[PDB]
mmCIF file of C-alpha atoms in Angstrom:
data_model
loop_
_atom_site.group_PDB
_atom_site.id
_atom_site.type_symbol
_atom_site.label_atom_id
_atom_site.label_comp_id
_atom_site.label_asym_id
_atom_site.label_seq_id
_atom_site.Cartn_x
_atom_site.Cartn_y
_atom_site.Cartn_z
ATOM 1 C CA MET A 4 -57.022 45.610 -20.600
ATOM 2 C CA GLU A 5 -56.934 44.221 -17.248
ATOM 3 C CA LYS A 6 -60.388 43.890 -14.821
ATOM 4 C CA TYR A 7 -61.071 42.462 -11.471
ATOM 5 C CA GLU A 8 -64.271 40.709 -9.556
ATOM 6 C CA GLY A 9 -64.577 40.863 -6.307
ATOM 7 C CA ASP A 10 -64.879 42.845 -3.067
ATOM 8 C CA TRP A 11 -64.093 46.822 -2.590
ATOM 9 C CA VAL A 12 -63.126 48.246 1.072
ATOM 10 C CA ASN A 13 -62.579 52.468 1.457
ATOM 11 C CA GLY A 14 -61.193 52.709 -2.539
ATOM 12 C CA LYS A 15 -58.847 49.475 -2.864
ATOM 13 C CA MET A 16 -59.812 45.519 -3.572
ATOM 14 C CA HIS A 17 -60.273 44.124 -0.102
ATOM 15 C CA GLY A 18 -61.313 40.682 0.757
ATOM 16 C CA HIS A 19 -61.648 37.656 -2.119
ATOM 17 C CA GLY A 20 -60.638 38.448 -5.663
ATOM 18 C CA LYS A 21 -59.978 37.500 -8.829
ATOM 19 C CA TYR A 22 -58.218 39.534 -10.950
ATOM 20 C CA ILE A 23 -57.214 39.538 -14.825
ATOM 21 C CA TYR A 24 -53.703 41.485 -15.632
ATOM 22 C CA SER A 25 -52.835 43.096 -18.762
ATOM 23 C CA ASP A 26 -50.465 40.161 -19.714
ATOM 24 C CA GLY A 27 -52.466 36.597 -19.946
ATOM 25 C CA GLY A 28 -52.321 35.464 -16.219
ATOM 26 C CA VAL A 29 -54.920 35.719 -13.341
ATOM 27 C CA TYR A 30 -54.869 35.807 -9.411
ATOM 28 C CA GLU A 31 -57.708 34.516 -7.394
ATOM 29 C CA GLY A 32 -57.844 34.482 -3.304
ATOM 30 C CA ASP A 33 -57.514 37.198 -0.459
ATOM 31 C CA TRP A 34 -57.114 41.203 -1.440
ATOM 32 C CA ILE A 35 -55.768 43.819 1.593
ATOM 33 C CA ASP A 36 -55.163 47.512 0.895
ATOM 34 C CA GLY A 37 -55.320 46.545 -2.881
ATOM 35 C CA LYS A 38 -52.416 44.216 -2.448
ATOM 36 C CA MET A 39 -52.740 40.331 -3.202
ATOM 37 C CA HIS A 40 -52.328 39.360 0.378
ATOM 38 C CA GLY A 41 -53.284 35.995 2.725
ATOM 39 C CA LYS A 42 -54.316 32.829 0.908
ATOM 40 C CA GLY A 43 -54.757 33.015 -3.040
ATOM 41 C CA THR A 44 -53.785 31.241 -6.023
ATOM 42 C CA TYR A 45 -51.393 33.282 -9.031
ATOM 43 C CA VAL A 46 -51.508 31.520 -12.904
ATOM 44 C CA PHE A 47 -48.875 33.189 -14.674
ATOM 45 C CA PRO A 48 -48.939 33.689 -18.710
ATOM 46 C CA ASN A 49 -45.412 31.476 -18.528
ATOM 47 C CA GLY A 50 -47.901 28.355 -17.571
ATOM 48 C CA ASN A 51 -46.204 28.636 -13.767
ATOM 49 C CA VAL A 52 -48.802 28.300 -11.073
ATOM 50 C CA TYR A 53 -48.123 29.486 -7.602
ATOM 51 C CA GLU A 54 -51.021 28.340 -4.340
ATOM 52 C CA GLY A 55 -50.250 29.458 -1.337
ATOM 53 C CA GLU A 56 -49.627 32.311 1.400
ATOM 54 C CA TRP A 57 -49.094 36.096 0.189
ATOM 55 C CA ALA A 58 -48.434 38.933 2.193
ATOM 56 C CA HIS A 59 -48.192 43.003 0.711
ATOM 57 C CA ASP A 60 -48.683 41.653 -3.135
ATOM 58 C CA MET A 61 -45.682 39.025 -2.703
ATOM 59 C CA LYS A 62 -45.278 35.281 -1.816
ATOM 60 C CA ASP A 63 -44.811 34.845 2.078
ATOM 61 C CA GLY A 64 -45.074 32.362 4.098
ATOM 62 C CA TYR A 65 -45.846 28.601 2.895
ATOM 63 C CA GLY A 66 -46.688 28.225 -0.680
ATOM 64 C CA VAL A 67 -46.280 25.478 -3.549
ATOM 65 C CA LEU A 68 -44.733 26.893 -6.985
ATOM 66 C CA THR A 69 -45.262 24.414 -9.424
ATOM 67 C CA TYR A 70 -43.493 24.825 -13.129
ATOM 68 C CA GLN A 71 -44.445 24.421 -16.611
ATOM 69 C CA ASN A 72 -41.865 21.281 -16.447
ATOM 70 C CA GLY A 73 -41.436 19.246 -13.862
ATOM 71 C CA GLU A 74 -39.807 21.378 -11.285
ATOM 72 C CA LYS A 75 -41.665 22.456 -8.508
ATOM 73 C CA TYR A 76 -40.849 24.295 -4.731
ATOM 74 C CA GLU A 77 -42.636 23.378 -1.668
ATOM 75 C CA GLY A 78 -41.594 25.475 1.524
ATOM 76 C CA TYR A 79 -41.720 29.191 2.861
ATOM 77 C CA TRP A 80 -41.300 32.347 1.221
ATOM 78 C CA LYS A 81 -40.341 35.815 2.536
ATOM 79 C CA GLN A 82 -40.798 39.157 -0.252
ATOM 80 C CA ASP A 83 -41.713 36.805 -2.992
ATOM 81 C CA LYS A 84 -37.784 34.775 -2.214
ATOM 82 C CA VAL A 85 -37.665 31.165 -1.732
ATOM 83 C CA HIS A 86 -36.903 31.687 2.443
ATOM 84 C CA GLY A 87 -36.386 29.159 5.494
ATOM 85 C CA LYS A 88 -37.524 25.346 5.248
ATOM 86 C CA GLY A 89 -37.987 24.351 1.372
ATOM 87 C CA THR A 90 -38.194 20.708 -0.510
ATOM 88 C CA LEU A 91 -37.219 21.942 -4.338
ATOM 89 C CA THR A 92 -37.506 19.266 -6.966
ATOM 90 C CA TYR A 93 -36.044 19.600 -10.225
ATOM 91 C CA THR A 94 -37.063 18.591 -13.670
ATOM 92 C CA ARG A 95 -34.105 16.002 -13.810
ATOM 93 C CA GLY A 96 -35.965 13.924 -9.834
ATOM 94 C CA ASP A 97 -32.824 15.576 -8.277
ATOM 95 C CA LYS A 98 -34.621 16.785 -4.578
ATOM 96 C CA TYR A 99 -33.348 19.178 -2.355
ATOM 97 C CA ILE A 100 -35.024 19.307 1.583
ATOM 98 C CA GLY A 101 -33.941 22.238 3.707
ATOM 99 C CA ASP A 102 -32.616 25.499 4.684
ATOM 100 C CA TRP A 103 -33.316 28.373 1.989
ATOM 101 C CA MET A 104 -31.867 32.381 2.596
ATOM 102 C CA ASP A 105 -32.662 34.781 -0.208
ATOM 103 C CA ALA A 106 -33.641 32.229 -3.053
ATOM 104 C CA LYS A 107 -30.310 30.666 -1.958
ATOM 105 C CA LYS A 108 -29.416 27.236 -0.015
ATOM 106 C CA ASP A 109 -28.237 28.165 3.036
ATOM 107 C CA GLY A 110 -27.800 26.134 6.225
ATOM 108 C CA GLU A 111 -28.438 21.996 6.701
ATOM 109 C CA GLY A 112 -29.689 20.591 3.847
ATOM 110 C CA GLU A 113 -30.545 17.054 2.302
ATOM 111 C CA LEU A 114 -29.979 16.634 -1.841
ATOM 112 C CA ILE A 115 -30.940 12.895 -2.960
ATOM 113 C CA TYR A 116 -30.042 12.784 -6.956
ATOM 114 C CA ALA A 117 -32.273 11.140 -9.348
ATOM 115 C CA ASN A 118 -28.838 8.721 -10.444
ATOM 116 C CA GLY A 119 -28.237 7.374 -6.768
ATOM 117 C CA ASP A 120 -26.009 9.647 -4.718
ATOM 118 C CA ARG A 121 -26.675 11.745 -2.225
ATOM 119 C CA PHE A 122 -25.298 14.916 0.031
ATOM 120 C CA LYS A 123 -26.135 15.964 3.451
ATOM 121 C CA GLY A 124 -24.521 18.882 5.257
ATOM 122 C CA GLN A 125 -23.834 22.273 5.338
ATOM 123 C CA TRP A 126 -24.773 24.574 2.266
ATOM 124 C CA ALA A 127 -23.734 28.592 1.973
ATOM 125 C CA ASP A 128 -24.438 30.754 -1.294
ATOM 126 C CA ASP A 129 -26.391 27.788 -3.108
ATOM 127 C CA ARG A 130 -23.530 25.259 -2.588
ATOM 128 C CA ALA A 131 -21.615 22.917 -0.001
ATOM 129 C CA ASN A 132 -19.871 25.133 2.260
ATOM 130 C CA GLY A 133 -18.809 23.600 5.767
ATOM 131 C CA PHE A 134 -19.322 19.410 6.780
ATOM 132 C CA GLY A 135 -20.848 17.326 4.867
ATOM 133 C CA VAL A 136 -21.276 13.546 3.400
ATOM 134 C CA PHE A 137 -21.525 12.864 -0.131
ATOM 135 C CA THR A 138 -22.366 8.824 -0.865
ATOM 136 C CA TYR A 139 -21.944 8.502 -4.319
ATOM 137 C CA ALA A 140 -24.066 5.609 -6.460
ATOM 138 C CA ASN A 141 -20.967 3.471 -7.119
ATOM 139 C CA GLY A 142 -20.337 3.272 -3.139
ATOM 140 C CA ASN A 143 -17.621 5.423 -3.178
ATOM 141 C CA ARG A 144 -17.904 8.023 -0.007
ATOM 142 C CA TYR A 145 -16.748 11.053 1.607
ATOM 143 C CA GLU A 146 -17.074 12.613 5.119
ATOM 144 C CA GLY A 147 -15.553 15.967 6.070
ATOM 145 C CA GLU A 148 -14.928 19.557 5.078
ATOM 146 C CA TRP A 149 -16.380 21.454 1.641
ATOM 147 C CA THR A 150 -16.125 24.713 -0.164
ATOM 148 C CA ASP A 151 -17.553 25.786 -2.821
ATOM 149 C CA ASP A 152 -19.205 22.343 -3.548
ATOM 150 C CA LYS A 153 -15.833 20.669 -3.720
ATOM 151 C CA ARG A 154 -13.575 18.394 -1.406
ATOM 152 C CA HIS A 155 -11.946 20.986 0.889
ATOM 153 C CA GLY A 156 -9.884 20.436 3.921
ATOM 154 C CA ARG A 157 -9.578 17.462 6.256
ATOM 155 C CA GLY A 158 -11.240 14.406 5.436
ATOM 156 C CA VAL A 159 -12.110 11.059 4.842
ATOM 157 C CA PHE A 160 -12.994 9.075 1.441
ATOM 158 C CA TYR A 161 -13.535 5.326 0.700
ATOM 159 C CA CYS A 162 -13.178 4.356 -2.747
ATOM 160 C CA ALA A 163 -15.602 1.042 -3.504
ATOM 161 C CA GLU A 164 -12.974 -0.365 -6.254
ATOM 162 C CA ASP A 165 -10.072 -1.070 -3.978
ATOM 163 C CA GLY A 166 -11.835 -0.289 -0.394
ATOM 164 C CA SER A 167 -8.448 1.411 1.020
ATOM 165 C CA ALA A 168 -9.972 4.589 2.880
ATOM 166 C CA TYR A 169 -7.898 7.970 3.279
ATOM 167 C CA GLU A 170 -7.726 10.411 5.996
ATOM 168 C CA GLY A 171 -6.128 13.620 5.191
ATOM 169 C CA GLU A 172 -5.914 17.422 3.593
ATOM 170 C CA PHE A 173 -8.041 17.829 0.663
ATOM 171 C CA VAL A 174 -7.524 21.038 -1.759
ATOM 172 C CA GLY A 175 -9.663 22.078 -4.607
ATOM 173 C CA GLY A 176 -12.214 18.367 -4.426
ATOM 174 C CA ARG A 177 -8.640 16.040 -4.757
ATOM 175 C CA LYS A 178 -6.141 14.741 -2.246
ATOM 176 C CA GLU A 179 -3.208 17.354 -1.599
ATOM 177 C CA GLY A 180 -0.583 17.590 1.535
ATOM 178 C CA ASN A 181 -0.265 15.196 4.253
ATOM 179 C CA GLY A 182 -2.508 11.925 4.779
ATOM 180 C CA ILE A 183 -3.142 8.492 5.504
ATOM 181 C CA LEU A 184 -4.186 5.557 3.240
ATOM 182 C CA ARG A 185 -5.366 2.154 4.601
ATOM 183 C CA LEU A 186 -6.243 -1.027 2.193
ATOM 184 C CA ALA A 187 -8.300 -3.833 2.453
ATOM 185 C CA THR A 188 -5.670 -5.848 3.502
ATOM 186 C CA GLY A 189 -4.498 -3.865 6.831
ATOM 187 C CA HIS A 190 -1.827 -2.065 4.856
ATOM 188 C CA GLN A 191 -1.038 1.381 5.424
ATOM 189 C CA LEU A 192 0.532 4.646 3.684
ATOM 190 C CA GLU A 193 1.432 8.151 5.665
ATOM 191 C CA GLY A 194 2.709 10.767 3.324
ATOM 192 C CA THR A 195 2.205 13.981 1.108
ATOM 193 C CA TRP A 196 -0.273 13.804 -2.152
ATOM 194 C CA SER A 197 0.157 16.284 -4.735
ATOM 195 C CA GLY A 198 -2.946 16.814 -7.275
ATOM 196 C CA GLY A 199 -4.531 13.356 -6.249
ATOM 197 C CA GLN A 200 -1.217 11.355 -6.925
ATOM 198 C CA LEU A 201 1.203 10.098 -3.936
ATOM 199 C CA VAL A 202 4.706 11.754 -4.102
ATOM 200 C CA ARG A 203 6.349 10.968 -0.766
ATOM 201 C CA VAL A 204 5.468 7.911 1.909
ATOM 202 C CA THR A 205 6.767 8.902 5.810
ATOM 203 C CA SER A 206 5.362 5.570 7.046
ATOM 204 C CA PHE A 207 4.251 2.548 5.658
ATOM 205 C CA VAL A 208 3.166 -0.213 8.133
ATOM 206 C CA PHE A 209 1.216 -3.123 7.881
ATOM 207 C CA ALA A 210 -0.491 -3.841 11.517
ATOM 208 C CA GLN A 211 -3.365 -5.663 10.410
ATOM 209 C CA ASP A 212 -4.286 -6.305 14.286
ATOM 210 C CA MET B 4 59.949 -38.733 21.413
ATOM 211 C CA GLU B 5 59.610 -40.177 17.729
ATOM 212 C CA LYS B 6 59.688 -43.529 16.302
ATOM 213 C CA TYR B 7 58.488 -45.456 12.842
ATOM 214 C CA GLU B 8 57.630 -48.750 12.535
ATOM 215 C CA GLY B 9 57.260 -49.790 8.425
ATOM 216 C CA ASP B 10 58.847 -50.561 5.183
ATOM 217 C CA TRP B 11 62.254 -48.994 4.406
ATOM 218 C CA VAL B 12 63.525 -48.692 0.806
ATOM 219 C CA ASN B 13 66.648 -46.592 -0.464
ATOM 220 C CA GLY B 14 67.683 -44.436 3.524
ATOM 221 C CA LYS B 15 63.898 -43.247 3.490
ATOM 222 C CA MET B 16 60.096 -44.942 5.035
ATOM 223 C CA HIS B 17 58.563 -46.281 1.729
ATOM 224 C CA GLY B 18 55.523 -48.427 1.606
ATOM 225 C CA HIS B 19 53.285 -49.231 4.513
ATOM 226 C CA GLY B 20 54.350 -47.476 7.864
ATOM 227 C CA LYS B 21 53.046 -46.494 11.290
ATOM 228 C CA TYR B 22 54.585 -43.365 12.791
ATOM 229 C CA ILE B 23 54.312 -41.852 16.369
ATOM 230 C CA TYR B 24 55.055 -38.311 16.356
ATOM 231 C CA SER B 25 57.424 -35.905 18.610
ATOM 232 C CA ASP B 26 53.944 -34.178 20.005
ATOM 233 C CA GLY B 27 51.227 -37.220 20.643
ATOM 234 C CA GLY B 28 49.644 -38.352 17.716
ATOM 235 C CA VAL B 29 50.250 -40.901 15.206
ATOM 236 C CA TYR B 30 50.352 -41.831 11.138
ATOM 237 C CA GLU B 31 49.355 -45.035 9.825
ATOM 238 C CA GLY B 32 49.344 -46.116 5.996
ATOM 239 C CA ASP B 33 51.060 -45.251 2.576
ATOM 240 C CA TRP B 34 54.821 -43.608 2.503
ATOM 241 C CA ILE B 35 57.127 -42.692 -0.699
ATOM 242 C CA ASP B 36 60.469 -40.944 -0.113
ATOM 243 C CA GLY B 37 59.351 -40.817 3.680
ATOM 244 C CA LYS B 38 56.920 -38.721 3.133
ATOM 245 C CA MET B 39 53.058 -39.376 3.774
ATOM 246 C CA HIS B 40 51.990 -39.929 0.265
ATOM 247 C CA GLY B 41 48.924 -42.611 -0.995
ATOM 248 C CA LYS B 42 45.884 -43.675 1.174
ATOM 249 C CA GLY B 43 46.430 -42.846 5.123
ATOM 250 C CA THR B 44 45.098 -42.075 8.164
ATOM 251 C CA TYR B 45 46.411 -39.131 10.781
ATOM 252 C CA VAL B 46 45.386 -38.596 14.723
ATOM 253 C CA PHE B 47 46.291 -35.514 15.678
ATOM 254 C CA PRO B 48 47.029 -34.405 19.181
ATOM 255 C CA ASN B 49 43.933 -32.022 19.109
ATOM 256 C CA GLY B 50 41.733 -34.736 18.815
ATOM 257 C CA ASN B 51 40.900 -34.316 15.200
ATOM 258 C CA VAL B 52 41.468 -37.335 12.593
ATOM 259 C CA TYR B 53 41.980 -37.707 9.033
ATOM 260 C CA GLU B 54 41.385 -40.855 6.793
ATOM 261 C CA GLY B 55 41.680 -40.221 3.260
ATOM 262 C CA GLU B 56 44.712 -39.531 0.053
ATOM 263 C CA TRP B 57 47.988 -37.893 0.808
ATOM 264 C CA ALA B 58 50.752 -37.004 -1.578
ATOM 265 C CA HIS B 59 53.902 -34.940 -0.658
ATOM 266 C CA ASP B 60 53.380 -35.142 3.039
ATOM 267 C CA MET B 61 50.064 -33.173 3.062
ATOM 268 C CA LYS B 62 46.185 -34.139 2.425
ATOM 269 C CA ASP B 63 45.613 -34.381 -1.498
ATOM 270 C CA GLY B 64 42.411 -36.299 -3.155
ATOM 271 C CA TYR B 65 39.728 -37.621 -1.341
ATOM 272 C CA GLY B 66 39.836 -37.447 2.682
ATOM 273 C CA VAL B 67 37.313 -37.001 5.212
ATOM 274 C CA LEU B 68 38.402 -34.613 8.687
ATOM 275 C CA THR B 69 36.388 -35.176 11.336
ATOM 276 C CA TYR B 70 37.032 -33.211 14.321
ATOM 277 C CA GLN B 71 37.029 -32.525 18.308
ATOM 278 C CA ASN B 72 33.931 -31.292 18.192
ATOM 279 C CA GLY B 73 30.725 -32.251 15.851
ATOM 280 C CA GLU B 74 32.769 -30.617 12.724
ATOM 281 C CA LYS B 75 33.338 -33.023 9.916
ATOM 282 C CA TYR B 76 33.948 -32.644 6.102
ATOM 283 C CA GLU B 77 33.798 -35.238 3.434
ATOM 284 C CA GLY B 78 35.538 -33.928 0.163
ATOM 285 C CA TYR B 79 38.609 -33.054 -1.824
ATOM 286 C CA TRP B 80 42.008 -32.015 -0.689
ATOM 287 C CA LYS B 81 45.040 -29.921 -2.830
ATOM 288 C CA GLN B 82 48.438 -29.582 -0.754
ATOM 289 C CA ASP B 83 46.740 -29.654 2.844
ATOM 290 C CA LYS B 84 43.912 -27.330 1.822
ATOM 291 C CA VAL B 85 40.196 -27.736 1.103
ATOM 292 C CA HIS B 86 39.835 -27.927 -2.659
ATOM 293 C CA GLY B 87 37.146 -28.802 -5.395
ATOM 294 C CA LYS B 88 33.746 -30.851 -4.150
ATOM 295 C CA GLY B 89 33.292 -30.858 -0.653
ATOM 296 C CA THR B 90 30.411 -31.316 2.180
ATOM 297 C CA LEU B 91 30.944 -29.537 5.430
ATOM 298 C CA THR B 92 28.915 -30.144 8.600
ATOM 299 C CA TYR B 93 29.174 -27.521 11.279
ATOM 300 C CA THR B 94 28.669 -28.697 14.603
ATOM 301 C CA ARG B 95 25.934 -26.162 15.049
ATOM 302 C CA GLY B 96 24.083 -28.846 12.272
ATOM 303 C CA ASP B 97 24.257 -26.483 9.379
ATOM 304 C CA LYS B 98 25.860 -28.222 5.968
ATOM 305 C CA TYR B 99 27.635 -26.735 2.905
ATOM 306 C CA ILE B 100 27.559 -29.096 -0.273
ATOM 307 C CA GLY B 101 29.245 -27.515 -3.548
ATOM 308 C CA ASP B 102 32.656 -25.967 -4.508
ATOM 309 C CA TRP B 103 35.405 -24.868 -2.641
ATOM 310 C CA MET B 104 38.941 -22.951 -3.547
ATOM 311 C CA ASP B 105 41.883 -22.844 -0.913
ATOM 312 C CA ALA B 106 39.942 -23.370 1.871
ATOM 313 C CA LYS B 107 37.370 -21.309 1.342
ATOM 314 C CA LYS B 108 33.826 -21.566 -0.624
ATOM 315 C CA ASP B 109 34.187 -20.309 -4.207
ATOM 316 C CA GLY B 110 31.234 -21.417 -7.615
ATOM 317 C CA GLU B 111 27.852 -23.177 -7.164
ATOM 318 C CA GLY B 112 27.064 -24.171 -3.202
ATOM 319 C CA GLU B 113 23.875 -25.113 -1.353
ATOM 320 C CA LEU B 114 24.120 -24.089 2.644
ATOM 321 C CA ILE B 115 21.338 -25.808 4.338
ATOM 322 C CA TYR B 116 20.292 -24.527 7.915
ATOM 323 C CA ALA B 117 19.447 -26.178 11.111
ATOM 324 C CA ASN B 118 17.080 -23.287 11.504
ATOM 325 C CA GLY B 119 15.249 -24.737 8.009
ATOM 326 C CA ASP B 120 16.558 -21.581 5.794
ATOM 327 C CA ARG B 121 18.547 -22.711 3.113
ATOM 328 C CA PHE B 122 20.833 -20.612 0.703
ATOM 329 C CA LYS B 123 22.478 -21.806 -3.009
ATOM 330 C CA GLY B 124 23.845 -19.954 -5.492
ATOM 331 C CA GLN B 125 27.760 -18.357 -6.671
ATOM 332 C CA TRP B 126 30.104 -18.366 -3.795
ATOM 333 C CA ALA B 127 33.599 -16.465 -3.714
ATOM 334 C CA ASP B 128 35.794 -15.643 -0.398
ATOM 335 C CA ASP B 129 33.735 -18.105 1.398
ATOM 336 C CA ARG B 130 31.061 -15.647 1.108
ATOM 337 C CA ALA B 131 27.301 -15.421 -1.205
ATOM 338 C CA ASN B 132 29.113 -13.734 -4.705
ATOM 339 C CA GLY B 133 26.738 -13.487 -7.334
ATOM 340 C CA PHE B 134 23.457 -14.896 -8.052
ATOM 341 C CA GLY B 135 21.827 -17.280 -5.809
ATOM 342 C CA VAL B 136 18.504 -17.749 -3.999
ATOM 343 C CA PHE B 137 18.089 -17.809 0.027
ATOM 344 C CA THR B 138 14.369 -19.593 1.175
ATOM 345 C CA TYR B 139 13.642 -18.658 4.957
ATOM 346 C CA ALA B 140 12.019 -20.487 7.120
ATOM 347 C CA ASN B 141 9.534 -18.123 8.146
ATOM 348 C CA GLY B 142 8.578 -18.408 3.705
ATOM 349 C CA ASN B 143 10.434 -15.306 3.217
ATOM 350 C CA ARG B 144 12.367 -15.632 0.212
ATOM 351 C CA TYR B 145 15.057 -13.519 -1.841
ATOM 352 C CA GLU B 146 16.397 -14.478 -6.091
ATOM 353 C CA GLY B 147 18.955 -12.269 -7.227
ATOM 354 C CA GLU B 148 22.194 -10.629 -6.916
ATOM 355 C CA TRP B 149 24.246 -11.074 -3.998
ATOM 356 C CA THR B 150 28.015 -9.120 -2.264
ATOM 357 C CA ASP B 151 29.494 -10.282 0.663
ATOM 358 C CA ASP B 152 26.989 -12.401 2.151
ATOM 359 C CA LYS B 153 24.552 -9.619 1.895
ATOM 360 C CA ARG B 154 21.556 -8.692 -1.122
ATOM 361 C CA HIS B 155 23.067 -6.101 -3.686
ATOM 362 C CA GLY B 156 22.141 -5.612 -7.010
ATOM 363 C CA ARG B 157 18.748 -6.275 -8.722
ATOM 364 C CA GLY B 158 16.406 -8.946 -6.908
ATOM 365 C CA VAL B 159 12.917 -10.244 -6.311
ATOM 366 C CA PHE B 160 12.363 -10.145 -2.128
ATOM 367 C CA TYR B 161 9.081 -12.001 -1.116
ATOM 368 C CA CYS B 162 7.597 -11.133 2.061
ATOM 369 C CA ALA B 163 5.512 -14.335 3.443
ATOM 370 C CA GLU B 164 4.013 -11.479 6.766
ATOM 371 C CA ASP B 165 1.714 -9.470 4.650
ATOM 372 C CA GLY B 166 2.260 -11.556 0.949
ATOM 373 C CA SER B 167 3.943 -8.744 -0.692
ATOM 374 C CA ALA B 168 6.988 -9.092 -3.484
ATOM 375 C CA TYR B 169 9.581 -6.578 -4.627
ATOM 376 C CA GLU B 170 11.587 -6.202 -7.666
ATOM 377 C CA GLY B 171 14.383 -3.699 -8.118
ATOM 378 C CA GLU B 172 17.902 -2.587 -6.683
ATOM 379 C CA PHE B 173 19.119 -4.110 -3.081
ATOM 380 C CA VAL B 174 22.280 -1.995 -1.448
ATOM 381 C CA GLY B 175 23.609 -3.847 1.277
ATOM 382 C CA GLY B 176 20.964 -5.797 2.173
ATOM 383 C CA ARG B 177 18.371 -3.686 2.047
ATOM 384 C CA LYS B 178 16.446 -1.969 -0.870
ATOM 385 C CA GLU B 179 17.515 1.151 -1.863
ATOM 386 C CA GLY B 180 16.590 2.768 -5.296
ATOM 387 C CA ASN B 181 14.193 2.426 -8.063
ATOM 388 C CA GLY B 182 11.741 -0.845 -7.589
ATOM 389 C CA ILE B 183 8.126 -2.295 -7.989
ATOM 390 C CA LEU B 184 6.229 -3.698 -4.840
ATOM 391 C CA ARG B 185 3.164 -5.747 -5.591
ATOM 392 C CA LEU B 186 0.961 -6.375 -3.150
ATOM 393 C CA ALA B 187 -1.437 -9.752 -2.306
ATOM 394 C CA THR B 188 -4.883 -7.324 -3.741
ATOM 395 C CA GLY B 189 -3.147 -6.360 -7.033
ATOM 396 C CA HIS B 190 -1.892 -3.261 -5.752
ATOM 397 C CA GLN B 191 1.470 -2.433 -7.520
ATOM 398 C CA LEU B 192 4.078 0.684 -6.525
ATOM 399 C CA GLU B 193 6.739 2.136 -8.817
ATOM 400 C CA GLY B 194 9.102 4.371 -7.481
ATOM 401 C CA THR B 195 12.345 5.288 -4.830
ATOM 402 C CA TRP B 196 13.624 3.052 -1.469
ATOM 403 C CA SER B 197 16.021 5.231 0.751
ATOM 404 C CA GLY B 198 17.784 2.244 2.955
ATOM 405 C CA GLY B 199 14.690 0.366 3.866
ATOM 406 C CA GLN B 200 11.912 3.232 3.656
ATOM 407 C CA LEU B 201 9.955 4.343 0.486
ATOM 408 C CA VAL B 202 10.948 7.840 -0.261
ATOM 409 C CA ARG B 203 9.410 8.804 -3.799
ATOM 410 C CA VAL B 204 6.354 6.873 -5.714
ATOM 411 C CA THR B 205 6.080 6.869 -9.323
ATOM 412 C CA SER B 206 3.110 4.947 -9.770
ATOM 413 C CA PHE B 207 0.418 3.432 -7.955
ATOM 414 C CA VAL B 208 -2.121 0.783 -9.597
ATOM 415 C CA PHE B 209 -4.595 -1.339 -8.250
ATOM 416 C CA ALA B 210 -5.452 -4.739 -10.551
#
């Protein structure tokens, strides 16, 4: 059995009001035309809680959704979906700050991982797409083009293990086709890579300069 | 206008004797059966001078030939040809010490260059053939097989310029075919070289 305690206008809930839904979990805050509208808080049966701005019975504008588990989103909503600027903390400790579209990461975004890794760059369909920089915990670093959370196209990868930066084509997160490899010495290699293994050397200069 | 002044036996020059030849240039020393034989010296018209051992009218045994120019050979002769152990100084300043055959370098020999370079190894037909070590003035060094004064077959070459060492096949004084290349880092490369350019990579590692 559902129930309400608040302000009535015309024949509908309007103004401040607290509402208990048939399923466990309540709402307290602002109402317009019998819909949740304005600043209010919802406590869900599943233990999740939203407090922030509503419009036409949905989360719209700035709001904070904290989950039963660590997960917490602080940012903007449009029609009950995460939309625009937003910061999401994952249970893991990983954090995304940046641009959301239709409950997916889309645009400029920085994801700082709990393992010390961090990526900043362009996102599309909730995955890295376009330019970006991944800096690995170990000291390895990528800078260049991404396709579907994979290093794809022209990129520069540095390997902390042996120095030796690579400049060239990437395919499916591995270096493929023409490229250049500088080692810490000043030794450079030009040629072709096949699935991350060097096949052919075009040039083999030194020129430390 | 020939002439002689020395010892006669039977009907020929025999014992000590000095001889002036038709062309300018003389001989003074030992004679047998009217031939230069034993210890004696010849001063040639061309300005060359030999002093050493003779047999049957030719240089045979140990002798010293000093030339019109700086060139000087100290070693063994057989029938007027440089033969066996010998040391030759060139006008250049270069020195060869070692084994000669029929007036050509043949066997074990060390050539010390005036530019600081040095080769030691096996010679044939007056050129490096078989094993040997060339050490370059700059610090570069080769050790392995030679064919006709060229690095040919299995060899190890070190390049002082980039402190890298290569182990593999050489063809015509350049690295060709399968080989391994270690760099100063610890990075090693396996694969095939063509002329002196890497074509194909088998392995690539860091140590």
